[PDB]
Write a protein that binds this DNA or RNA. Structure first.
Ligand code: MG
Ligand code: MG
Ligand code: MG
Ligand code: MG
Ligand code: MG
Ligand code: MG
Ligand code: MG
Ligand code: MG
Ligand code: MG
Ligand code: MG
Ligand code: ZN
Lengths: 170, 63, 107, 189, 52
RNA sequence: GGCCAUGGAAGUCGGAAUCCGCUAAGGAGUGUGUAACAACUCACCGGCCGAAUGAACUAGCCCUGAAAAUGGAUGGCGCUCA
């Protein structure tokens, strides 16, 4: 269960450099302790800065703009497998940016055995145009007048024994 | 080594062969087929001296 | 890249022969050999040019270019199936004497 | 990928009345009725009209989608079996030993009796499936005509006859003897 | 002796085949993989050899 | 029926070659067939339908790779949208 955070940090000011540049990252983390931890993890992949020589300036939750609008998200990924490092791009249907990332973490765990530690989120983009959708497993839900049944419904029973024959209509 | 100015004669004695464009295409048919032998065709092998006038070397627009 | 160049040469020579001569009628064949076609153009050295190719290319490559040579337009719905072209200009009788000449049949 | 929905359209000719109830297809045509149970597949049926039927798979994976056009083809084969019939022609192929084939009836059952195959003293008997008609062609020498409404039974009887005539302990590239299916068509040309 | 028309009919079922190189399977000539599980559906195939 | 080999080899036994001409189409030929041709089949181009298609690679689970001796061990039962 994740949240999207805006984390802003900078190098500690010096008499040489008293206003270092402020860098922001959007972090998908379960809580604010991991959000500031993940921030320093990525700054040390790019900038000559450390947690000992730096400073966290702001941590803020980024809420969904239209949390009850159904969207299609494209997520660009860079994950590590048992053998190498790979770039990937996948698409998810959800109403929040965070909920697509939660589906993403479940999805790469299941099909590629990629743990949380092995995944970098390069970019999450809401696809405005139906022509922006490249993947067929989410494009099939953008067809006009979409209808489908749910055959073979299995009902969960509170009791061990039922006195009537089971059914699966729905 | 031939032509011996008679490679057109070989084309105009074999006048009934290549159903080409304008007579000179008949000469190229003997040019192509005689390359499969390999002799003193102007010093080397054909598919070369052929390809000179094929693009346009000296002058054989014989009527 | 070669095909688009050979396509360009095909439309180049398609319009080169269109203005040089004029007027053409129905010209369809079937079960016609390669040596069968060589016979017609053997006697038709210069009085006619056996323009050849296919269908789908010819229709659109001219239909889109109905600006420099419009006139045709509604003429395109005529091009169905195995149809060649014999680019020439003589008379309704003077061409069928030299073209219809060779016939190969079968039971 | 779990395709949301996949469809196929059956086409019912004018004189044919398909009839489907609980995945039990009963196809009726001028030539008769054929029935087939499909309870081993998860498909649903919709009658578009009297001449067309939609066959649908909902939320099916690759193999479960693959099982849809085969349902279509089986019902289409049923339709053409009750509107055109099926006919397999077999030619008798032998280099030296003529194959003596008779249509015998023993114990109230029809059998195809192959004798002298590759000179063997053994008599081969193939049971003729119900609904399958055998005939020795008069217009052709060494030809057997297997006909019937059901394509599956006709082709399987033909295969039985072909399989009982397999060559053992020889170079089968050289010893090409046997009974082979030469033509697979319909009763109505 | 078999007439050439009948010898082509026979050769379909006896000769026109491909063979798996690891487990010796009679495969269709156009087959790209062996249908047997024991060899792992290998693509290492070769045509059935002919009399000569 | 290209040259040379060859009893013969004409595309389809074998060697230098791998060209040309017409073509939108065609290889001095991908096969079956001949003592040899012929024959048909393909290479490529046509007509037809009409919206997708082919190739290489990466890594998840599964399978092949995977052979030992008393009967037997994910602890056992058993489990397959587990
Ligand atoms: Mg750097
Ligand atoms: Mg999910
Ligand atoms: Mg998933
Ligand atoms: Mg998914
Ligand atoms: Mg990492
Ligand atoms: Mg209950
Ligand atoms: Mg033996
Ligand atoms: Mg396997
Ligand atoms: Mg294993
Ligand atoms: Mg559970
Ligand atoms: Zn195998």
């Amino acid at each position: 269960r994740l949240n999207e955070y805006q984390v802003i940090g900078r190098n500690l000011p010096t008499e040489s450099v008293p206003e270092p540049k402020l860098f922001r990252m959007r972090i998908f983390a379960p809580n604010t302790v991991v959000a500031k931890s993940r921030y320093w993890y990525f700054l040390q992949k790019l900038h000559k800065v450390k947690k000992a020589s730096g400073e966290i300036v702001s941590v803020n939750i980024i809420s969904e703009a239209k949390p009850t609008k159904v969207k299609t998200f494209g997520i660009w990924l860079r994950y590590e497998s048992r053998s190498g490092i790979h770039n990937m791009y996948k698409e998810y249907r959800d109403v929040t940016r965070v909920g697509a990332v939660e589906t993403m973490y479940q999805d790469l765990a299941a099909r590629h055995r990629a743990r949380f530690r092995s995944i970098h989120i390069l970019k999450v983009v809401e696809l405005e145009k139906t022509d922006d959708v490249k993947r067929q497993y989410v494009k099939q839900f953008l067809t006009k007048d979409l209808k489908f049944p749910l055959p073979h419904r299995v009902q969960k029973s509170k009791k061990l024994f039922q006195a009537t024959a089971p059914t699966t209509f729905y | 080594n031939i032509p011996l100015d008679e490679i057109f004669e070989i084309a105009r004695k074999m006048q009934h062969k290549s159903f080409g464009k304008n007579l000179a295409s008949v000469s190229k048919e003997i040019l192509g087929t005689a390359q499969s032998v390999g002799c003193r065709v102007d010093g080397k092998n054909p598919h070369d001296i052929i390809d000179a006038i094929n693009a346009g070397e000296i002058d054989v627009p014989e009527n | 890249g070669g095909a688009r160049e050979k396509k360009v040469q095909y439309f180049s020579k398609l319009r080169e022969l269109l203005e040089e001569y004029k007027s053409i009628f129905v010209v369809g064949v079937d079960n016609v050999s390669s040596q069968q076609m060589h016979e017609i153009r053997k006697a038709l050295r210069g009085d006619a040019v056996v323009l050849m190719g296919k269908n789908t290319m010819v229709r659109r490559a001219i239909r889109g270019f109905l600006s420099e040579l419009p006139e045709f337009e509604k003429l395109l719905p005529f091009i169905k199936g195995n149809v060649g072209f014999i680019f020439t200009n003589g008379d309704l009788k003077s061409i069928r004497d030299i073209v219809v000449s060779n016939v190969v049949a079968a039971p | 990928m779990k395709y949301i929905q996949t469809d196929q359209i059956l086409d019912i000719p004018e004189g044919v009345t398909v009839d489907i109830k609980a995945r039990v297809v009963k196809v009726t045509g001028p030539r008769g009725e054929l029935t087939k149970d499909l309870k081993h597949i998860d498909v649903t049926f919709n009658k578009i009209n009297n001449r067309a039927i939609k066959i649908t798979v909902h939320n099916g994976d690759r193999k479960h989608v693959a099982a849809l056009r085969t349902v279509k083809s089986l019902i289409a084969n049923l339709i053409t079996g009750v509107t055109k019939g099926y006919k397999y022609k077999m030619r008798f192929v032998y280099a030296h030993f003529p194959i003596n084939v008779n249509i015998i009836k023993k114990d109230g059952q029809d059998y195809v009796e192959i004798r002298n195959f590759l000179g063997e003293k053994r008599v081969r008997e193939v049971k003729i499936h119900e609904g399958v008609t055998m005939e020795i062609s008069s217009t052709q020498k060494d030809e057997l005509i297997v006909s019937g409404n059901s394509l599956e039974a006709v082709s399987q009887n033909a295969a039985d006859i072909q399989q009982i005539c397999r060559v053992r302990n020889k170079d089968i590239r050289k010893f090409l003897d046997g009974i082979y299916v030469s033509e697979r068509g319909t009763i109505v040309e | 002796m078999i007439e050439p028309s009948l010898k082509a009919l026979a050769s379909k079922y006896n000769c026109e085949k491909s063979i798996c190189r690891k487990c010796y399977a009679r495969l269709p000539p156009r087959a790209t993989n062996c249908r047997k599980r024991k060899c792992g559906h290998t693509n290492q195939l070769r045509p059935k050899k002919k009399l000569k």
